[PDB]
Design an enzyme around this catalytic site. Sequence first.
Site, PDB file in Angstrom:
ATOM      1  N   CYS A   1       0.692  -0.981  -0.012  1.00  0.00           N
ATOM      2  CA  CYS A   1       0.154  -0.358   0.551  1.00  0.00           C
ATOM      3  C   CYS A   1       1.180   1.672   0.062  1.00  0.00           C
ATOM      4  CB  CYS A   1      -0.528   0.157   0.980  1.00  0.00           C
ATOM      5  SG  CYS A   1      -1.893  -1.380   1.888  1.00  0.00           S
ATOM      6  N   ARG A  31       3.559   0.887  -5.569  1.00  0.00           N
ATOM      7  CA  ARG A  31       3.082  -0.382  -4.065  1.00  0.00           C
ATOM      8  C   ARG A  31       1.615  -0.634  -3.772  1.00  0.00           C
ATOM      9  NH1 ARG A  31       5.372   1.842   0.387  1.00  0.00           N
ATOM     10  NH2 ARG A  31       7.135   2.133   0.603  1.00  0.00           N
ATOM     11  N   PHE A 207      -3.188  -2.678  -1.707  1.00  0.00           N
ATOM     12  CA  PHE A 207      -2.391  -4.605  -2.838  1.00  0.00           C
ATOM     13  C   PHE A 207      -2.506  -5.004  -2.020  1.00  0.00           C
ATOM     14  CE2 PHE A 207       0.494  -7.364  -3.383  1.00  0.00           C
ATOM     15  CZ  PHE A 207       1.744  -6.649  -4.497  1.00  0.00           C
ATOM     16  N   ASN A 227      -1.516   1.544   5.552  1.00  0.00           N
ATOM     17  CA  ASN A 227      -0.829   0.622   5.370  1.00  0.00           C
ATOM     18  C   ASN A 227       0.083  -0.326   6.214  1.00  0.00           C
ATOM     19  OD1 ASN A 227       1.133  -0.161   3.058  1.00  0.00           O
ATOM     20  ND2 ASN A 227       2.531   1.573   4.331  1.00  0.00           N
ATOM     21  N   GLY A 228      -0.073  -1.452   6.424  1.00  0.00           N
ATOM     22  CA  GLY A 228       0.307  -2.192   7.558  1.00  0.00           C
ATOM     23  C   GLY A 228      -0.113  -3.177   7.524  1.00  0.00           C
ATOM     24  N   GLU A 871      23.414 -18.993   2.019  1.00  0.00           N
ATOM     25  CA  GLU A 871      23.145 -17.484   2.985  1.00  0.00           C
ATOM     26  C   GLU A 871      24.734 -17.565   3.059  1.00  0.00           C
ATOM     27  OE1 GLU A 871      22.162 -17.657   5.888  1.00  0.00           O
ATOM     28  OE2 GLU A 871      20.285 -18.065   6.056  1.00  0.00           O
ATOM     29  N   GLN A 937      13.830 -20.757   6.334  1.00  0.00           N
ATOM     30  CA  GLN A 937      14.647 -22.138   6.451  1.00  0.00           C
ATOM     31  C   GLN A 937      13.257 -22.901   7.534  1.00  0.00           C
ATOM     32  OE1 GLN A 937      18.244 -21.563   8.233  1.00  0.00           O
ATOM     33  NE2 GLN A 937      18.482 -23.612   8.415  1.00  0.00           N
ATOM     34  N   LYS A 940      13.417 -23.265  11.202  1.00  0.00           N
ATOM     35  CA  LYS A 940      13.231 -22.062  12.328  1.00  0.00           C
ATOM     36  C   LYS A 940      12.223 -20.876  11.434  1.00  0.00           C
ATOM     37  CE  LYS A 940      18.979 -20.627  11.430  1.00  0.00           C
ATOM     38  NZ  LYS A 940      19.762 -21.760  10.834  1.00  0.00           N
ATOM     39  N   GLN A 946      21.994 -19.099  11.464  1.00  0.00           N
ATOM     40  CA  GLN A 946      23.064 -18.917  12.167  1.00  0.00           C
ATOM     41  C   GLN A 946      24.469 -19.787  12.027  1.00  0.00           C
ATOM     42  OE1 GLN A 946      22.025 -21.215  15.509  1.00  0.00           O
ATOM     43  NE2 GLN A 946      19.911 -20.832  14.343  1.00  0.00           N
TER      44      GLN A 946
HETATM   45  C1  LIG Z   1      23.497 -28.016   6.440  1.00  0.00           C
HETATM   46  C2  LIG Z   1      22.726 -27.355   6.449  1.00  0.00           C
HETATM   47  C3  LIG Z   1      23.059 -26.201   5.858  1.00  0.00           C
HETATM   48  C4  LIG Z   1      21.333 -24.807   4.998  1.00  0.00           C
HETATM   49  N1  LIG Z   1      22.031 -24.039   4.832  1.00  0.00           N
HETATM   50  C5  LIG Z   1      20.591 -23.132   4.667  1.00  0.00           C
HETATM   51  C6  LIG Z   1      20.797 -21.830   4.531  1.00  0.00           C
HETATM   52  O1  LIG Z   1      22.237 -21.441   4.209  1.00  0.00           O
HETATM   53  N2  LIG Z   1      19.468 -20.782   3.520  1.00  0.00           N
HETATM   54  C7  LIG Z   1      18.780 -21.646   3.670  1.00  0.00           C
HETATM   55  O2  LIG Z   1      17.728 -20.844   3.205  1.00  0.00           O
HETATM   56  N3  LIG Z   1      18.452 -22.865   4.404  1.00  0.00           N
HETATM   57  C8  LIG Z   1      19.841 -23.392   4.381  1.00  0.00           C
HETATM   58  N4  LIG Z   1      19.778 -24.587   4.546  1.00  0.00           N
HETATM   59  C9  LIG Z   1      17.977 -25.711   4.179  1.00  0.00           C
HETATM   60  C10 LIG Z   1      17.814 -25.707   2.835  1.00  0.00           C
HETATM   61  O3  LIG Z   1      18.440 -25.101   2.009  1.00  0.00           O
HETATM   62  C11 LIG Z   1      16.347 -26.654   2.802  1.00  0.00           C
HETATM   63  O4  LIG Z   1      15.705 -25.894   2.455  1.00  0.00           O
HETATM   64  C12 LIG Z   1      16.581 -28.363   3.245  1.00  0.00           C
HETATM   65  O5  LIG Z   1      18.219 -28.390   4.262  1.00  0.00           O
HETATM   66  C13 LIG Z   1      15.465 -29.008   2.859  1.00  0.00           C
HETATM   67  O6  LIG Z   1      15.575 -29.881   4.711  1.00  0.00           O
HETATM   68  P1  LIG Z   1      16.217 -31.659   3.757  1.00  0.00           P
HETATM   69  O7  LIG Z   1      17.357 -31.446   4.389  1.00  0.00           O
HETATM   70  O8  LIG Z   1      14.826 -32.048   4.370  1.00  0.00           O
HETATM   71  O9  LIG Z   1      16.282 -32.117   2.397  1.00  0.00           O
HETATM   72  C14 LIG Z   1      20.653 -25.426   5.295  1.00  0.00           C
HETATM   73  C15 LIG Z   1      20.579 -26.645   6.074  1.00  0.00           C
HETATM   74  C16 LIG Z   1      21.637 -27.476   6.194  1.00  0.00           C
HETATM   75  C17 LIG Z   1      21.334 -29.211   5.828  1.00  0.00           C
END
Ligand SMILES: Cc1cc2nc3c(=O)[nH]c(=O)nc-3n(C[C@H](O)[C@H](O)[C@H](O)COP(=O)(O)O)c2cc1C
EC number: 1.4.7.1
Length: 1475
Positions: A1, A31, A207, A227-228, A871, A937, A940, A946
């Site tokens: 928005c 937007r 949007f 907007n939020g 990453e 991911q 988490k 991390q």
């Molecule tokens: C050792 C390790 C490192 C990972 N590093 C990343 C990361 O850098 N960025 C990310 O999005 N997911 C990361 N993941 C997750 C993978 O990108 C993917 O989503 C995931 O491993 C799928 O799960 P699976 O091991 O059951 O096949 C990591 C997973 C593991 C095994």
Amino acid sequence: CGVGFIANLRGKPDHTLVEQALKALGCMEHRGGCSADNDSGDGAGVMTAIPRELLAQWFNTRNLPMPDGDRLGVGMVFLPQEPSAREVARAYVEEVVRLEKLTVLGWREVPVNSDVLGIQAKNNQPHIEQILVTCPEGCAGDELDRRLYIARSIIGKKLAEDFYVCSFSCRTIVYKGMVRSIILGEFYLDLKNPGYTSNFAVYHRRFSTNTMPKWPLAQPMRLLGHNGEINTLLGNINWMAAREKELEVSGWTKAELEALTPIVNQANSDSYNLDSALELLVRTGRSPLEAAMILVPEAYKNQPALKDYPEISDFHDYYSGLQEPWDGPALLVFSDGKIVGAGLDRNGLRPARYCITKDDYIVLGSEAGVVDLPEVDIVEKGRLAPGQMIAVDLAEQKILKNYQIKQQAAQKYPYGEWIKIQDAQTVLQQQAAFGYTAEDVEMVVVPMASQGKEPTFCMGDDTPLAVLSHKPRLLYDYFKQRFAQVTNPPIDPLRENLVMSLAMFLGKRGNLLEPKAEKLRSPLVNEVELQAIKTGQLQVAEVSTLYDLDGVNSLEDALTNLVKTAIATVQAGAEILVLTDRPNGAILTENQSFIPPLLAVGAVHHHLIRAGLRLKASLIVDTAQCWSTHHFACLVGYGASAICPYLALESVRQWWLDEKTQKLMENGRLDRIDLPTALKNYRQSVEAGLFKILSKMGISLLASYHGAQIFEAIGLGAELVEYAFAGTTSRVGGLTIADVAGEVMVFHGMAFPEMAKKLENFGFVNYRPGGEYHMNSPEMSKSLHKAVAAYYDHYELYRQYLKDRPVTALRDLLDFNADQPAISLEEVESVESIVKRFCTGGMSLGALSREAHETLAIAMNRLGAKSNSGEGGEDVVRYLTLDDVDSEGNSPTLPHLHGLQNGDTANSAIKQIASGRFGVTPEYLMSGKQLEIKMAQGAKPGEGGQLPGKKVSEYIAMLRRSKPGVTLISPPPHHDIYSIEDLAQLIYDLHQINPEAQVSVKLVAEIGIGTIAAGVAKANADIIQISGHDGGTGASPLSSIKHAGSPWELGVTEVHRVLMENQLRDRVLLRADGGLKTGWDVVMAALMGAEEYGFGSIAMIAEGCIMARVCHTNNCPVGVATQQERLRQRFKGVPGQVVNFFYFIAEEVRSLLAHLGYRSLDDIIGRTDLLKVRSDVQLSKTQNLTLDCLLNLPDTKQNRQWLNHEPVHSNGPVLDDDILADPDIQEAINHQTTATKTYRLVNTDRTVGTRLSGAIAKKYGNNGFEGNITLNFQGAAGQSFGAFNLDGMTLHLQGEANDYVGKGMNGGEIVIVPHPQASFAPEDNVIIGNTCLYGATGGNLYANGRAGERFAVRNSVGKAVIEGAGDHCCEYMTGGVIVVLGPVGRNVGAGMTGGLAYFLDEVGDLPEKINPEIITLQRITASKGEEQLKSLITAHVEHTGSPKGKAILANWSDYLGKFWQAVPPSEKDSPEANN
Ligand SMILES: Cc1cc2nc3c(=O)[nH]c(=O)nc-3n(C[C@H](O)[C@H](O)[C@H](O)COP(=O)(O)O)c2cc1C
Ligand code: F3S
């Protein structure tokens, strides 16, 4: 928005304001969103005063006397198009308007031109008429809107897409609908009529995350455009909804209040709901400014800026007990007629730029250069920092945040006035029966108690879902946490803790409406706090969460009477009910079991609500069965106002207080632990956990978390859910009350009849011969590995382990139901062709060793598939295909790999962009065939990467351009994406820099991913990836491995469906990943919607992961997830091995396609009708599970067009496209050329410079170019100005820019200057927005003015000079030098871990603001620091003329006295903070 307002104080109404407001809607177009059409808008709207002139002709023509300003009053109504029905509807507006003692003078058909509507909007257009009304009694202003307020709410009880009041006031009116922003005036012709004049205008561009526009939903509401996203909706609604029968105000009749009967509603949007609520507040005697303060409170705790305003600290101090924040991002822009103002959510998650003239003409909005004032005569250019409001008042005055808030500080005061005035070892088997397990205490409570942090762990939740496992489980385990994704941001709980609180209010909430003069530091309460409070304000019946056997037969009964006890006790005046499982002090074998603390607080908390009573008491759960971080959050979640974890707390006592432990403390385990520390740690560790879970969804206050229900239940059947946990999604619908009863019997069996020695161990966390299953385990994975290494008997093995597997995922309930004859394997598409769909999954170069990582990439490339750089950046060197390979199978270019063909390449096909942007660099982006935005991911969801410091070697540090020692917790949000339009900005940034590259966005399954995805699709993504709660990490919290996220079978399904219904399914290819390892898995995800398939952990195994599960540790014995050279050298593992694994997996696929009968995976995707529920399976805990949610998808038999995506989405014609068009491809291909060009920029020009920079980078990479292109610009610059800028690329901005300047800046220079024609103080004036220099990797930015929040957020190496800034300066900074010549908001420290910063904060107050957790505040001492400062403070002046630059230069010796240098320990000993 896009939102904003315009006000004219010093003029009488003109048309030009209206002209200007329309224009600006136009400049908000990006937007906003469109529909299947690409033509109809998600909505546009404008609020103005009554265009009392224009309505003239109406009265005139009817020869009717026009009433006084204050006494006319106008409904904009939407009415059905069908004539008979239009009149039914008209007669009703009038009927109810007549029902207050008002008269109707009639109705004005609203001139409109339906011809400009897009087809969907046109098809759907209500018929639009304004009704004119008056009060014969002589009612006026406040009384008349107040009446019209009662009136529109009554009409609202019959609200329809066809029948809706937009606005009904004698002061303000709303013209809105389903149009694209600039069309708004083409449609409504009044807005182009010069007889239309207003002193203001609130405008809004919408949007939506769908394709199917409904006119009432366009949006400036009756009071506010918003907007939020409210991220605590279900909570806030539930609490309000409970205020509703007990509304009491100043003379307001019990019949009039009952008339707003339901002022808040689940079904409506966060905005409708907020507006409605805001209205109640206003109409009942507050000003929109104050009502917004109550509902979207500033973050006041710790605010240097509140020093001399202690009134307001007490305003929210007070309201805090009464009204919990409507959290989430929010720019609120609202009007009364009387006042128009804007204010931000507490975190300020939406930009608000504003402008003031010598004549006190004001313009606010989401973006700067939008309304086109005459620069010669601007007087301020500012912005609202987090929490701030700014308003205008009819009596000709603008009103900045300080008055404002004092003005409700001043009154109703009592503020601080009234605030002031307000033994054996049975433990071993209590533990057993409340459902503790060996792992729970050893692996969870103990670590919390000894280290004061919930435990880290690795790889993903390997085990079956609570409901599908055979091992006893908690009710808690059935709730998965929800988290924020594209639609709103998580917030950073460590780096931004100063905005949260775990406070919790114990008294009954009063009247929100009536400020009368007539508290728990944390939700956790120790035996002390408990008793303290059983003294307190009131007495507090315990309710036996307990119940004896036979007599009261069932948990159902016990539930029933608990509720009744609870209801009756509250009636009897009870203001707190302690729900104990420890009633009168004991827990027997015949006190035969409990009510689970979660199922209890739920039942009380909803049944109270159902009873009318919830506002009356507040609830404590007194429980053995709560110890986990997740546990508490489930409790506060479904209602607990607080928690005494008595038996958890005890297990710290029994643990510490025990020889084994005390011994190891005498040598071994850190015996820096008197019981007072174990205890203080146990809880301090629960606090960090509640913070964490809250921030996963971007919530600040437990107060907000508390109502809300920020979970998704999985395996609970409908009636159980309704009864205990009302309005939680549970799509698989399993367990019954009895069903749960039986399960608590399973661990009641084993503490009483049985023997109490040690609590059992089910290898939940870690594979065990005795215990819970695990898709992966060390023995299984050693044989898989030996299979691949050959080229047989192992898969019999491996395939075996795979067999003895119980029910684990949802796909395991499902089998196939071929609709065709089986087929010849030779018909089926080749292995080579399936393999193209495979992906290895972006695991961080940090997390894995480079041997493990480079290997996956070589192997993936061989297959013609793709691999992914997680990453942590990619080492440039990989970007080159290899010559050097020799007979042995080695290459000097990568001496550490093995088995390399001469054709190999280790360069990642997918390059990730994640919150920390570690390697994120122009060549980086150009090196990838695809680009991945990582929203979350699986291990988490609401959290960042991390990488513990152990693992950050010099290599990694060099790649990430971060410091060698130091741990890297990336930020939970991309500081870049606070909403879907923001997502759309980054997608566009990336399409912009490398147009050739498909952009994916990586989302994690949870209820709601469907809607989000619709948005991602509208936001121009090429690929969406759904990741189950299943998947791996090389470091995550154990709680999050186990309690955040949902099955990808729900993820994929839901996205695939919603995308199909919205007709967006063709816009995007879907990937799934989440514990896939098997041809079958692949086939099941294809049936479910997915077209590509991702493999993390198995790809790892295949290269020789055993499953040590020691990834966070840096000990992998196997060379995979370590940086240790020693261990790396042990990496067996060759590209060939994974190349093979995937052919296995493909072959396995081909044969399924055969049983099934189709040639090609292309034939199967979303052919969900091919699935049926399995004959075999029955589980231990419920009869069955509803699988409508995976079976019921759009029939795919003939519509398969959606399977054809365009090759790459376009950003469309862009200013760079032209920049790169003239005598310019010479200055490039002739490597050393000076070029200059000037252009006017308007703020739809976004990401300017970037494409040219990609273009240079694609050929010279990051530093190959010693040319010099100077691009000079004029006007207001939109989002991401000068992103990914490169060396000898110079950028002049004459004017101002918006958010993200210099995002990803790599090199070169960016100078930004007011327009000279200004008569203002650059120093005192904003010139740049939030999140500038985001992942800056090099370059120098120079900016004559104040800058936004998060300046240089994760700055790695860029340098800059600016003249003032908001909060979070230098947020995650890691290197570079940042120089600030003017004041600055709070958290000036957060996570800054390397680089130098110098400020100059003359108010002397800086150190009050600074984030004390890591950096340090010096006065300049080392001459080499002065030299550093000067050199920039000078170069700034050389680049600008910066009046503030020049002042300090000639008084070099004065200002230079106290004026701080921020040193991260890590810079302590450099030549510029020592000697
Ligand atoms: C050792 C390790 C490192 C990972 N590093 C990343 C990361 O850098 N960025 C990310 O999005 N997911 C990361 N993941 C997750 C993978 O990108 C993917 O989503 C995931 O491993 C799928 O799960 P699976 O091991 O059951 O096949 C990591 C997973 C593991 C095994
Ligand atoms: S689980 Fe991790 S620590 Fe090792 S064997 Fe696998 S990479």
